[PDB]
Design a protein around this ligand. Structure first.
Ligand code: NOJ
Ligand code: NOJ
Ligand code: CA
Ligand code: CA
Lengths: 687, 687
């Protein structure tokens, strides 16, 4: 039996093979069982004994090591991250197939990562995975914060329930989406967050998802065991491998303090170091607005014309079509956004609907759907470039692919060259619809390769990428820091489609944000969508002060202010917080955190002595007793508090807020109350 | 009921809608039934009554027209082709679905073409084909010359049998291949050739296979009706369509003279005119030798080293590996081939195994299998280029993809740029293995798009393409004349893998060649492969003189002399015919033709007064009584006859030949005998 312990001696992992040679591990934290005895292994597709990569193993060799080094991300929640673990690598020989694998375990003070490694050898070269069988056996019927396991979307509201209740709730939890493939009545996605009856918080996830299919979890709800369930390709297979190769890491992050789940950097720590040598010279955080919410609410259109039943690029002559009078991506309107962005200190303006093809973009399984380079007649690329550059603004490129992936790859070098030629150095991509090639899913090994290919190629052009609908992140930004965002979860757009649950932003930082930032597009001040489009009666489940808080509580180096300029102009005093808030941080302090209920975070803006605080709360609101002892002794600060007014409420009174300005020091304390679906934001600037 | 008749009144096509509103057609030739009443229509994938595009139609309108214009191919069997037909277009309206299609019929003196057309309209825009239901009802249990219906290979020997015998022969007709998907016990490929008891020859095929899935034929052997059977995608669907759009043409070529099947230009006539405006300036025929037969026989290797269990491009350092002593694509060897090519008036030298990756090329479903640009340590790209240039020789590029198609697309512009930068202006591509993306077949709509994308992109680079394993041709060379070849049928390589049937080359011109030329790689003089590789006991099923004949009887603007130079050196007198024979023709006269038995053809070399003749024969040999009245009155010609010796035989005495030189005029006659698996060749040069 092998035993591995954390540097602080609080976690212990024990490993051994059972009497049939099945690799088995368990994990305790402060003498409490976190992972009951659980097996590890894979089943291979038949080309018989060779399909078995799950038992019949003997421990052939073991190697231990300790690692303790600090490194600096290009952008992040703090300036420096420490990577400190004890490691055990176990070489497992399978006599019946004359082949070996290695399982490598890295144990941190805040949890465990493991992966399988497949050395090059005479009897293991090319192989296909039928299923991975990594188990995570739970010690109780925990509370879980989960979304349905699905090969194609993550755009679901979270459910909070016991593990035993998942099966009963799955049908209701799967809401409609134009591309979705659930796989089990007890399947959930990663990162999965849980709260135990004996006071632990446990997060199950993976890190460094490269050259492999995305992992979901399937629950055996009799034994309370989660098991890896990979995403199949068009033929049902779960990964083409060639040695030497490795699986991604699988992680169990655990603490008796929920704040320490947010603090963990295990996911980043398990990714390969930055491979973009000059990254710091060109990768930069971006605060932006955009021509966007018009189309999301239905006020405006992405399409230039309504008169055609379909379009064929390079045949359809848009100069001969009638403008529909709703096309928001027109030069004059874009210039007005550039004006507002420059006036208020934003870095960029996104424009969607700029290019030919939007008439057919949705649900047609169309191959040649966009060319990514040809503008509509009312979008003057060169004039918009020149005007933005003169005003100090960068335009952000939009590459919706409509999930037509061969089409995007064929156009990608020309599309990136077009960006370089026209002053665009960041692009928001998207993959709406069922994947083409047809039969593949959004999160299979094939598409994972695509998303990273797009990122690696972008890096060669010094382009930053934010990909909507892509596989959810697993820390690869460490390796490729030009991946500055994904959506890859249910974002603010769904506040226009019926709403997100009130507690949504009190869960995302414990789940989605583990592995990388989200382009959540916060900042809606007019929360009634019917003021944009009288036919849309959706209401954003937030107060205005909570929207402000999200600039601190939804971490990202890429931050949109998503409302339209005229709405911000109606509340310019509150808007000041969005203008002031930083995007990049030297320190972060998690002040309060309870998943599904509240999150309060203070961050120190990079290369400054200034701090920003946000709190976001769920259905029951939250009372904070803040203590400002993280400020510098002897310094005075000008603090501006943006808070819910008394009786603010996301539903009945969302726009009621107060703003109070005064002096804070490290001796200050403030009592603040977040409303139902409310929150607060504080700027704290050194005098 | 509508009647359409050929210009010469010999053929009549009758069309009507039947009682249930199914469009049906029939065809007669000289008062003999060719096609019995047969239905037309398609079934669509469900998004109920909208799935029906096969009945419930009524005739809304008809238009007739006559077309009679001549055009000139860039390269071909003659200088000018006449396109002369009577047309009927029927507009068919479907009340229950409020939509219309058009079926267009073109009737020539030698057969019928039809296609379906789908106009843009309110109720037919995007749709997916479940099956096409084009019927061809036969009037009898004909003799057919067929290969098994298959979505992935055409590399089968032909079978000659009655239609009623196909079922019982299918199992034995399907021989092993690395990628094959047969679909029916009575499924066959097109072009399908038949001979009827009442003296007709009937060929069933398609033309202009663009943006659509390849058609095979499935035989109802109780009623003798063939029906279109399209190639499914990874999900089983049979084509994504968007109006306005058309199916390919379906063709019935018929005559009571088998020579007239060979003379038909229906397939080319039904393709769109040339879209490469400057094609005449850079597209040109190519006679070549190659570093190739070494590897096909096993004498030499494509791989550089035998040391590695697999390779990772960009990681494996070949300069640190041991040469295997068998790698034929080495500079010195390549220079000896260039020497031979230049000494004997060849245009080009193909080299295979020049680039990194060949250690892994076969059967591994490997994604990143080649980069198409990085040479092995022993292949000096620049020196070979300089040396070839000094000798007036062009190198022919090789792009085997190992069926990894995303990989080839991602590299394609870099690969074509590397060709341009290094003086390569033609490329032989290949698709050996099951297709990646996995789940697709070689002949589905998805891959058909790929092969044409490769050709269209090549045209932008002024590059000519010869693609092995691609979908078999349907006349698209007319539209893109830089498609100078495919294999896409069983070629000479199989003569090294056990042999082709003796009658193979007496069938190919009636089947495979209809739609475009084949890179058959004739010219094997040493027909016992065991002299290349003693472990290889394969024997080419040919005499030497029949190999000479193939330069005339297997038409192609791309002609290999496939043997190694040292073998040609042994038989240099016979090699003279290969040296002399032209590649491109002002006229072709089909002298004798019976499928499966013999084919004799005379052609006039373009821009000359010289003629070349070849005869290829089956198992029984063939006696020819040639009459040279196609020569010019009053001219004398120097004729050289390369013929089988009287005791020649493909098996027992293949290298026995005679060469006779003398004078011919248009009054001359020659009696010649082709041996079993033999033939003869004649050069006829004006004094
Ligand atoms: O690309 C169109 C639309 N697709 C979905 C993306 O999430 C949204 O932000 C974008 O506006
Ligand atoms: O590309 C390797 C090999 N594949 C099959 C092709 O038909 C053959 O000509 C070529 O030599
Ligand atoms: Ca989305
Ligand atoms: Ca081949």
């Amino acid at each position: 039996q092998q035993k591995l312990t954390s540097p602080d001696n609080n976690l212990v992992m024990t490993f051994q093979v059972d009497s049939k040679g099945a690799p088995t591990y368990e994990l305790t934290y402060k003498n409490k069982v976190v992972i009951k005895p659980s097996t590890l292994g894979l089943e291979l597709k038949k080309e018989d004994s060779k399909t078995n990569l799950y038992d019949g193993f003997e421990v052939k060799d073991t190697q231990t090591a300790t690692f303790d080094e600090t490194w600096q991300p290009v952008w992040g929640e703090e300036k420096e991250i420490r990577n400190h673990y004890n490691e055990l690598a176990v070489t497992l020989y399978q006599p019946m197939n004359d082949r070996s694998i290695v399982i490598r375990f890295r144990l941190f003070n805040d949890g465990l990562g493991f992966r399988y490694e497949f050395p090059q050898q005479k009897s293991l070269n090319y192989f296909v995975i039928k299923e991975e069988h990594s188990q995570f056996g739970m010690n109780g019927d925990h509370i879980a914060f989960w979304i349905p396991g699905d090969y194609d979307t993550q755009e679901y509201d979270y459910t909070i329930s016991r593990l035993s209740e998942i099966r009963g709730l799955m049908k209701e939890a799967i809401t409609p989406n134009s591309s979705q493939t659930p796989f089990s009545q007890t399947g959930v996605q990663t990162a999965l967050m849980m709260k135990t009856d004996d006071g632990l918080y446990i997060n199950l996830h993976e890190a460094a998802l490269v050259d492999y299919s995305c992992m979901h979890l399937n629950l055996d709800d009799k034994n309370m065991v989660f098991e890896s369930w990979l995403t199949p390709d068009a033929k049902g297979d779960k990964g083409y491998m060639q040695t030497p190769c490795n699986t991604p890491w699988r992680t169990i992050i655990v603490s008796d303090d929920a704040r320490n789940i947010l603090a963990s950097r295990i996911t980043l720590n398990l990714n390969e170091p930055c491979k973009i040598a000059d990254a710091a010279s060109w990768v930069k955080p971006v605060k932006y607005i955009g021509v966007w919410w018009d189309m999301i609410t239905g006020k405006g259109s992405w399409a230039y014309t309504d008169e055609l039943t379909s379009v064929k690029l390079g045949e359809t002559d848009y100069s001969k079509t009638k403008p529909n009078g709703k096309h928001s991506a027109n030069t004059a309107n874009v210039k007005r956004y550039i004006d507002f962005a420059a006036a208020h200190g934003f870095d960029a303006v996104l424009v969607e609907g700029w290019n030919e093809g939007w008439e057919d973009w949705f649900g047609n399984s169309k191959d040649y759907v966009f060319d990514f380079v040809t503008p509509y007649p009312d979008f003057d690329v060169k004039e918009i470039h020149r005007y933005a550059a003169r005003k100090g603004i960068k335009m952000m490129m939009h590459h919706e692919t409509s999930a037509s992936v061969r089409n995007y790859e064929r156009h990608m070098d020309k599309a990136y060259q077009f960006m370089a030629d026209n002053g665009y150095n960041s692009v928001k991509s998207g993959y709406v619809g069922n994947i083409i090639p047809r039969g593949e899913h959004h999160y299979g090994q094939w598409m994972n390769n695509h998303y990273l290919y797009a990122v690696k190629k972008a890096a060669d052009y010094k382009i930053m990428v934010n990909a909507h609908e892509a596989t959810r992140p697993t820390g690869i930004c460490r390796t490729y820091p030009n991946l500055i965002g994904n959506e890859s979860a249910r974002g603010t757009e769904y506040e226009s489609f019926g709403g997100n649950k009130v507690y949504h932003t009190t869960i995302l930082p414990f789940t989605r944000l583990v592995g990388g930032p989200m382009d959540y597009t916060p900042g809606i001040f007019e929360t009634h969508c019917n003021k944009m489009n009288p036919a849309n009666n959706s209401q954003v489940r937030s107060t205005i002060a909570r929207q402000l808080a999200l600039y601190v509580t939804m971490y990202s180096p890429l931050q949109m202010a998503a409302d339209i300029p005229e709405n911000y102009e109606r509340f310019m005093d509150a808007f000041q917080f969005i203008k002031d808030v930083a995007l990049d941080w030297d320190e972060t302090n998690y002040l309060e955190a309870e998943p599904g209920e509240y999150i309060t975070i203070a961050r120190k803006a990079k290369d400054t002595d200034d701090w920003y605080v946000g709190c976001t709360a769920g259905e029951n609101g939250h009372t904070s007793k803040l203590v400002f002892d993280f400020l510098t002794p002897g310094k005075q600060y000008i603090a501006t508090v943006y808070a819910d007014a008394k009786d603010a409420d996301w539903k009945e009174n969302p726009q009621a807020y107060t703003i109070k300005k005064g002096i804070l020091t490290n001796k200050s304390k403030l009592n603040l109350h977040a409303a139902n679906g409310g929150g607060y934001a504080i700027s704290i600037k050194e005098v």
